[PDB]
């Protein structure tokens, strides 16, 4: 169902990818959270995020926000607002987005579903 897609910042992923500017506070849905296999401490999480229009896989959560993952406030289907993030462009042109500050607006249980049918950003 897509009747909640007005809750998400449609177009924010394309804007981050295209322009790389960080002076926005987009509202996104978490699609998945996976640990990066770094082989060392601390755990680090990579997130697949949706803005209702696209998904993007190259988000990394900052270490100070790990307790949100560990205590399940931040989990698949929740809706969150990003308050501070950094864009780092790799040598090959891909962009990693590091989420430094965020707020969970609606828990995974409260949302209950995946919102819309966002298309993977090409990429």
């Amino acid at each position: 169902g897509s009747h909640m897609v007005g809750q998400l910042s449609r177009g924010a992923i394309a804007a981050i990818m295209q322009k790389g500017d960080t002076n926005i506070k987009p509202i996104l849905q978490v699609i998945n959270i996976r640990p990066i296999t770094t082989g060392n401490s601390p755990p680090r999480y990579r997130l697949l995020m949706s803005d209702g229009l696209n998904t993007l896989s190259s988000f990394m959560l900052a270490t100070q926000l790990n307790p949100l993952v560990e205590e399940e406030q931040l989990s698949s289907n929740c809706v969150c607002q990003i308050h501070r993030f950094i864009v780092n462009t790799l040598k090959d042109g891909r962009r990693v987005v590091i989420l430094m500050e965020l707020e969970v607006l609606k828990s995974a249980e409260a949302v209950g579903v995946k919102i819309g049918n966002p298309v993977p950003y090409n990429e």
């Binding site: 990066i36 770094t38 990579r46 270490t63 790799l90 090959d92």
Partner: peptide, 13 residues
């Protein structure tokens, strides 16, 4: 708590 080269490693193709 990471470097640019860490990101390249974690994101390696």
């Amino acid at each position: 708590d990471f470097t640019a080269d860490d990101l390249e490693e974690w994101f390696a193709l």
